[PDB]
Amino acid sequence: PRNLLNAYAGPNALRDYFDPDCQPMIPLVEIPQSLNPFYEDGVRIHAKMMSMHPSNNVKIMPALNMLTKEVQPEKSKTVIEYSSGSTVISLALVSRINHGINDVRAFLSNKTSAPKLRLMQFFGLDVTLFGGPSQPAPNDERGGIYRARMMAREDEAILNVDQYENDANWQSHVKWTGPQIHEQLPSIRLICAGMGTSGTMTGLGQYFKTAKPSVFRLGVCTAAGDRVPGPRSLALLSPVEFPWRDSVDAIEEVGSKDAFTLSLKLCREGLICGPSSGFNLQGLFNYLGRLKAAGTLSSLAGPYGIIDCAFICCDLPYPYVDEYFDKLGDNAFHPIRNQNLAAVDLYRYDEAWELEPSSALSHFEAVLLDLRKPEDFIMSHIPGSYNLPLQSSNASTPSPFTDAMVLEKQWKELEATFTLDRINAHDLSGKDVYILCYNGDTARVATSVLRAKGISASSVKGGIAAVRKDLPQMQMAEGRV
Amino acid sequence: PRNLLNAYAGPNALRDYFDPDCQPMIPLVEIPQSLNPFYEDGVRIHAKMMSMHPSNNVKIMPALNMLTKEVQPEKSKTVIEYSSGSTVISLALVSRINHGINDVRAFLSNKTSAPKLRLMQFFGLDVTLFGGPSQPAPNDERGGIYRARMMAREDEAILNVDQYENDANWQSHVKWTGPQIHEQLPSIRLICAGMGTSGTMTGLGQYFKTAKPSVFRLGVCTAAGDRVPGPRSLALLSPVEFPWRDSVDAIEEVGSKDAFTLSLKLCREGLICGPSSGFNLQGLFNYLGRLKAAGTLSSLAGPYGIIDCAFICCDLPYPYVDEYFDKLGDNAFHPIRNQNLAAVDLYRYDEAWELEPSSALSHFEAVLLDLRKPEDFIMSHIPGSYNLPLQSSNASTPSPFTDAMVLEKQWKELEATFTLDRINAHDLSGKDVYILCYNGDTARVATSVLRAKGISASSVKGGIAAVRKDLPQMQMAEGRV
Amino acid sequence: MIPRNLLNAYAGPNALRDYFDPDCQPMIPLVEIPQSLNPFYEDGVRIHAKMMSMHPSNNVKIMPALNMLTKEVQPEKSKTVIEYSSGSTVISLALVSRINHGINDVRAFLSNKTSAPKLRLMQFFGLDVTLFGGPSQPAPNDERGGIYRARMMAREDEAILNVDQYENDANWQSHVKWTGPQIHEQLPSIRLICAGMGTSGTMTGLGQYFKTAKPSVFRLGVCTAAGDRVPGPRSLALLSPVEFPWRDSVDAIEEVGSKDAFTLSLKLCREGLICGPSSGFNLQGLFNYLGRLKAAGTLSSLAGPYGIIDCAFICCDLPYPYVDEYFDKLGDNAFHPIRNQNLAAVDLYRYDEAWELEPSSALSHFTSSTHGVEAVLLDLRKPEDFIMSHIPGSYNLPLQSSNASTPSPFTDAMVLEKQWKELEATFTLDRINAHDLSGKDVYILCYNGDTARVATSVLRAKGISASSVKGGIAAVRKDLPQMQMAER
Amino acid sequence: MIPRNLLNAYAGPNALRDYFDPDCQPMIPLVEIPQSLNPFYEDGVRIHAKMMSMHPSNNVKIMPALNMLTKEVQPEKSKTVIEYSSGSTVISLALVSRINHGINDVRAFLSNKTSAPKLRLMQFFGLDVTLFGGPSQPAPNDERGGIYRARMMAREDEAILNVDQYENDANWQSHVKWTGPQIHEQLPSIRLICAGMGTSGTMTGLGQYFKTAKPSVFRLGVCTAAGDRVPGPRSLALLSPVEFPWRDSVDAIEEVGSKDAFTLSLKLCREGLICGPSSGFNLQGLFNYLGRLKAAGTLSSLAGPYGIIDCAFICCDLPYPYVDEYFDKLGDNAFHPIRNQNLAAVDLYRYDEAWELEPSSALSHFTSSTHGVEAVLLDLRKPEDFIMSHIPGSYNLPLQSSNASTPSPFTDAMVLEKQWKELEATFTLDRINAHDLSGKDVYILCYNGDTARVATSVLRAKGISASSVKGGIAAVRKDLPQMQMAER
Ligand SMILES: C=C(NCc1c(COP(=O)(O)O)cnc(C)c1O)C(=O)O
Ligand SMILES: C=C(NCc1c(COP(=O)(O)O)cnc(C)c1O)C(=O)O
Ligand SMILES: C=C(NCc1c(COP(=O)(O)O)cnc(C)c1O)C(=O)O
Ligand SMILES: C=C(NCc1c(COP(=O)(O)O)cnc(C)c1O)C(=O)O
């Protein structure tokens, strides 16, 4: 039945890996008390981490169930679907794993984020952008849902399962998701899921309608005028023909700021899930808050006085990371320390460029650069070396690697110092350039600058202080010719 | 022992969820034959999807093992670590789940990508950037590894486990990862893992050194001068003091282009993993290619003539999506169709703004805008309406929702049309503005333009062709006053 | 005693030669400056300006140019004239080379730092300019500056000629020949002669002449104050290497800054003595010397047995090439500001009375031609007035800046700016094509008519054949039954 | 018969009044243009230029300005002068208002489209400019243009005065009084008189005078060709509303474009008759009419019993305010290009001979002052030469553009550009602080010495007190033992 060792081999290893009946049950995890403001009221909330399927999103269940139902083995060569992201990724994976179909065309709104659009391309989707409403009605003849079902109707090699209109959508959660939650949480008193196509909620609600009729079925929609990835609003849901009205006992409306806030909290607790997951949990919070404000929370409780709630976590937060910062204030994140270093010191450092004093002077076709101030150079320097001073490097200035502002000034002055004319004015091109400063640190920054400009540059570890220590017998010129 | 139902409840649900002994074994999946160029030679390659731990990366094993070893319950209040990303995310999760520590400070190179830096902030890390080499030696006194261990040495409330120097790193894979692969693949003939801190490889190599001494242990390093997230090069690995030289039988060197290529292929097969995972598989490919070129591949084979290879998949590709496009050519991705629509039609469309002809004219404080050409307006128009023509909208021009170039021209001309002066010149401010065109489509684009500018605008579904059809009794002015 | 042209009429094939001749010409005018410009008038000094700017060439250097070329040019060998110059000398050489000697290949060696307006002036007069990058006013023997290299090129070629104003005695001798004797005859009671020093030819000539012709006249040279720069003269330091006997030609030397030079030059112009910065530079030196003797109480000595003291100073050229510098050197005061200055950036295009049509002629042309293919009528009124009554077949393009209350844009500059800007912002290329205005007669009707004429200026600048209905909508009220009926 | 100033010397408290008086002044010069400019010289026509630009005011409008103000000004009531103008008239009014009438509050009403150089010129002459946005050359009765509004303001206030050049007969009567009689006396054989028409005062005056004083002279007016624009005149269409009897003053009217006007004005200047665009505009009209009769073979009739035909045309003002337009209107030819033009953008800063020091004086100052606190020595040579031998205590700042082979930057313009650019790019603010040059005496040593002087120009423009070692490293070879020993 199920894979005990979670080990999949043979020609069908990937098929069985994605199989919800063969792979272990999708994890169900109770959220911590610190995140559950109804813990003292006896509420225990459990998160169904659909993001932990190998596909990383809840829409793998409709995609699996639809494709096995609708694919015709000899003739089905192309799959087309309108989607907000998750379904077409799941269709792309299942079409290859189960059906050998690599031509998957994704129809998406032109107002889907750039990271999400790049993720579609990443998974090998062929995407076409559509103007107008990002969430059109399946009968809006100007929208991508209509165009998709009409392109597969004129060509039998083209297949359009219809996640907005194909019953195999919600039946996938009667088949898999529902029974899993029931076995994992036999004391379940409330099931909660947000509604986009509504397939997830109606599937769960149709299953629990007869598997445990005492279970309360709570769907979540996006507040009017708001937008969150995954669900749609109550208005955008009315034209859909799935039996969602028979699968829910109450509807909550949730905004995007709460959704992204709770998703961020869940991820920091260890339950890594995306914005719609925090959206769902917030809807559950809002309904529990009504029953407490109405004094009716006792109605959900079982014989032990506890209320076991399960809610769906639909996918991962990674595709939406930038949106968390646009929607949530800076107060939700620690700022970067030494943030200025992101725009500077951009180039690599190789340990082989840093040479011990004896090793560097043995190679010395070759040119030695001294980056100390002009009067320090005249006082004493290695005979044969050129002087090239810097405003930002004294004998007293701190090491650039201990002061981010020093590193910024020194790196920038070094980038401006080593212009093209400068390289030729000192004959650095094509030679082994050895660099020396006071303690070696500014010189090492200079090697990163020069290596990125193609000059074979090395630095002396410890600077001139180490050559005076390690090589005390090498006598030094003290402006004398 | 292990959680049969994958259901975690009680105050320790999250602790047990992250527990590798309590949670099902990390999946091991054989890669498809199409991705395995040595399938006919009898090689079967199995991927250990460490990315499928709830933390989504392999470094959860060192983080778990180190923190339980080093945390002192009463005094340990702050955790500090230098990392390339994975470890500090895993330390942030485990420090909160197992030890109640929320003060986690991450020391990172200034040359880590911006998406990765934002991911650190996302998971609640307090990050400080460090110049110089992005992968310093643990004894480089200018690098972040030294600074981390020295800041926890001066303060007992500060804890620095040392992933580069703490043996609990690699022992975590002797404890968990090794035994899991052995039980999942008893016929294992070769174990493969890339080396950054080397903890993963030495742990696996120390375990199999005595669990099944016939197993070949293959480590992978980054080719000289190259860079891939996770591992380091053979040179950057020499100073580390873990017994990695006793845990490997051969070393492969792999470049970044191959690493990102194979990761992309793995993700498109259904094994969603990041660049170091394709890096590892490529190293395995390169060693198998030597033995075939040397005719020695038979040496790895078991009694049935097959060679069972296991390799580590370390994390997910999502934080690196943009890097795949910089490293791989455009030839690896389908381009966006109607790409021009990404920069235009930027605003939302609400179904309630589109009104049937009878419904819109019933509300008609109110102003009706007609967007048809001037001669068409004079020919016949709804009495009481203003005319506002557009260069890009004829009676013959196609619907904007069927031609992306038409949508771009019309939307841009509409954005330029409805300037501030225009809004006041037609008294649109504060009124209910109804918009009419030929077929309704240009008018609907105009409502998205005007709603985003704060004007309460609605369109007539079907345009003037529908008011002539649905309302044939409403007589129309035909430039007559 | 040569006679001068009493009719100032110059005919014949030598009309231009005689016109430029300081002996045929009337004498260069000498004009006493007014009291309001003479601080020492109450002390008996009379300051007379020698307006060298009034020669046909407009500058003092026509005298050295005439004299040097007459001396140096070889009728059959000379074919090219080359000279280093700051501007005046080489313009004068171009004129004399052609008028008097039939030479047009005149090359001008100039500093690379002379102003961009001045460089164009050299081109304007048909000069051939080569730039030299060293010091602006080099020493004549500096083997880098143009003075030396111009001299050597004239040595290598026997067909080209460098008269060299910097050490040819004919330079300063031309003022012994003309300027000196003229001033002496125009002002016999003269007691002091003043001139700035660039090459020092003008001052050397005046001082050498008056040294013997009237030894009692004081000779006052003017040099540029160190660190400063004035067009024409040189600083004392920059003047020492020239070998003209200028030290023997002056009895004292003043130093003057550029701010004072431009200020006094500007005041002389507003008095009617139109002259450039070096003229105010010379007058300021004279003021400074006269103020030195007045404060020391030695002012009386310069006089004679008469109480008056007659001083003459040189006015070298005209201010027009330097107008820009007066604004940079002097403050925002001493100039009246341009009022309605905002209009300088709007209403940039021409008007034509033919574009403004009587209402009956305009409505006749509109309904003559088929509507929407040959002619359109734009009605700029607010949409709720347009709806009430309008010319059938016309288009409504509302203007926010225009309504039934707005006054004439030509009576308020802010209205003109707002309305011209909105009209310019209204008639984008899409708007022209949205109403298909191209190739059509366009008629404009507004509340005003003045606004509508502004609209015709804007549209015809864009190539649209637009005309306005004179008098506005008020002038066609009698042709609009619906409008007449609404007023019941 | 009033006498004229035979000395051209004007003294006394009325020196400026007499200086501007056309009756005290010598007559405005009349000068025959040369054959090279007269295509019809072989046919017996002699064309004489009346250089009105030679009045002290430099323009033709001083005659209407003098005559109108003399007529209209009220000694005790008049305190402000207001006039719409294109430029010439209102400058002349400012001068006459002060010289002759002691009035300085002169307001100038100008089109908002007059050039930015011309607007500054109005400010320069102390005028008070108000801009008007309508048509540039409005009709005198257009109640929007400045002509009408200037007239009304003078009506509301009995203390201000608009002489109104556009319909005051004293405008054209001033040329019956002066310009006409002068030309007639300067050229008694005259057969034709030619002038452009703006207000038409000049042509009306000349034509009304010659109509009776010598009825046989042909009167040839010139107007601006439709669609074109010339500074001064008007088009025939724009001229019809003025009520001067100009139609009665002309026997024919030519139309001329602006390109021909500027081309001929430029040629007249290079001949020595310095005059502006309207002057070439008048001459081109005369050429066009004479070419019409020559092609028709009716040229002989204009003559007399003599074979010659003497024509006079007006030259109105000077070209200097319009120099920019000649470049825009005419091609790149007719001007010589500036050679070494690249130098105009480099070597922007001054030089001083005191900065260049004899080698012994430079090395003396350097080792006098303590090194690195009061003085530094920069050695611009290549690092491998600097290592071989250098002045002890000096810093090496290599230049790629300079080495022992490079010639003098003042002998090759490309070397000067490269070296000045690299020196400017070398001495960034960090470089000055990297060697702590601020507040120190700085001495420059190079292979050349010329390069080192360029370096001193660059550094002193940045405030660094830099001097150069004259003669370069070659001049200090005797002071360098190590260098002498290497040459064995
Ligand atoms: C509609 C699809 N999204 C459903 C979805 C939902 C909503 O689940 P539904 O089955 O559509 O009701 C929630 N969260 C995420 C991340 C989702 O992708 C889609 O990818 O086309
Ligand atoms: C060093 C850590 N990275 C190790 C790593 C590796 C290498 O595994 P090691 O245990 O360091 O040898 C591979 N792939 C990814 C994504 C990784 O993050 C870190 O996050 O600090
Ligand atoms: C040197 C020349 N300038 C002399 C000059 C002077 C000086 O006059 P000198 O005769 O050169 O000393 C004053 N004012 C103006 C306008 C001048 O042009 C020249 O044109 O090259
Ligand atoms: C109208 C005036 N211009 C007349 C003019 C003319 C025309 O001359 P009239 O006398 O205005 O017809 C020609 N050339 C120049 C340079 C002029 O300035 C004026 O100054 O306002």
Indicate the topology:
Four copies of one chain form a homotetramer.
Chain A: E1 7-8, H1 13-18, E2 28-30, E3 43-49, H2 60-70, E4 78-82, H3 86-97, E5 103-109, H4 114-122, E6 126-130, H5 144-151, E7 158-159, H6 168-184, E8 188-194, H7 199-211, E9 216-222, H8 234-237, E10 250-254, H9 256-269, H10 275-293, E11 307-313, H11 321-327, E12 354-355, H12 357-362, E13 366-370, H13 374-379, E14 386-387, H14 404-417, H15 420-425, E15 432-436, H16 441-451, E16 457-460, H17 463-470
Parallel strand pairs in A: 3-11, 4-5, 4-7, 5-6, 8-9, 8-11, 9-10, 12-16, 13-14, 13-15, 15-16
Antiparallel strand pairs in A: 2-3
The structure holds ligand P1T (4 copies).
What would your notes on this structure say?
- With 481 residues, the first copy, chain A, is of the alpha/beta class.
- The first copy, chain A, folds into three domains: 14-56 and 173-332, 3-Layer(aba) Sandwich (Rossmann fold), CATH 3.40.50.1100; 60-159, Rossmann fold (3-Layer(aba) Sandwich), CATH 3.40.50; 351-470, Oxidized Rhodanese, domain 1.
- Chain A has helices at residues 13-18, 60-70, 86-97, 114-122, 144-151, 168-184, 199-211, 234-237, 256-269, 275-293, 321-327, 357-362, 374-379, 404-417, 420-425, 441-451, 463-470; strands spanning 7-8, 28-30, 43-49, 78-82, 103-109, 126-130, 158-159, 188-194, 216-222, 250-254, 307-313, 354-355, 366-370, 386-387, 432-436, 457-460.
- In chain A, strands 2-3-11-8-9-10 form a six-stranded mixed beta sheet, with helices on both faces.
- The longest helix of chain A is centred in the middle third of the chain and has 19 residues, at 275-293.
- Chain A is elongated and about 100 Å long.
- Chain A starts with 6 loop residues before the first strand and ends in an 11-residue tail after the last helix.
- The interface between A and D is medium-sized, with 22 and 28 residues.
- Strand 2 of chain C pairs parallel with strand 1 of chain D, so a sheet runs across the interface.
- The structure holds the ligand C=C(NCc1c(COP(=O)(O)O)cnc(C)c1O)C(=O)O (4 copies).
- Chains C, D: InterPro entries: Cys_Synth/Cystath_Beta-Synth (IPR050214), Rhodanese-like_dom (IPR001763), Rhodanese-like_dom_sf (IPR036873), TrpB-like_PALP (IPR001926), TrpB-like_PALP_sf (IPR036052).
- Chains C, D: Pyridoxal 5'-phosphate binds at residues 88, 198-200, 202, 278.
- Chains C, D: It holds the Pfam family Rhodanese.
- Chains C, D: Residues 371-485 form the Rhodanese domain.
